[PDB]
């Protein structure tokens, strides 16, 4: 349960921050 | 420019789906 939630957060945070970086630069 | 936005939009979209499922089931 932890292993999936943690990874999900990581993937969510990553993909979003990438989007920010993708647009701005 | 937009090519990377699309990939990022998709990555985040799947990632939030991943977080939804992980927290739920």
CA distances from B10 to A14, A21, B18 (A): 12, 15, 12
Domain that holds residue B3: 1-25
> Please, are residues B19 and A16 in contact by the beta-carbon 8 Å criterion?
no
d(CA B3, CA A15): 15
A3: which chain B residues are within 8 Å (Cβ-Cβ)?
A: none
CA distance A5 to chain B (A): 5
CA distances from A13 to A8, A17, B14 (A): 8, 6, 12
The total number of structural domains that make up chain B = 1
Q: Which residue of B18, B24, B25 is the best one to mutate when testing the A interface, meaning the one whose CB has the most A CBs within 10 A?
A: B18
> Please, are residues A19 and B23 in contact by the beta-carbon 8 Å criterion?
no
Cross-chain residue pair B12–A16, CB shorter than 8 Å: yes
**H/E stretch holding A16:** helix A2-24
Neighbour tally for A21: CB within 10 Å: 11
């Amino acid at each position: 349960y932890y292993k999936e939630i943690a990874h999900a957060l990581f993937s969510a945070l990553f993909a979003l921050s990438e989007l920010y970086i993708a647009v701005r630069y």
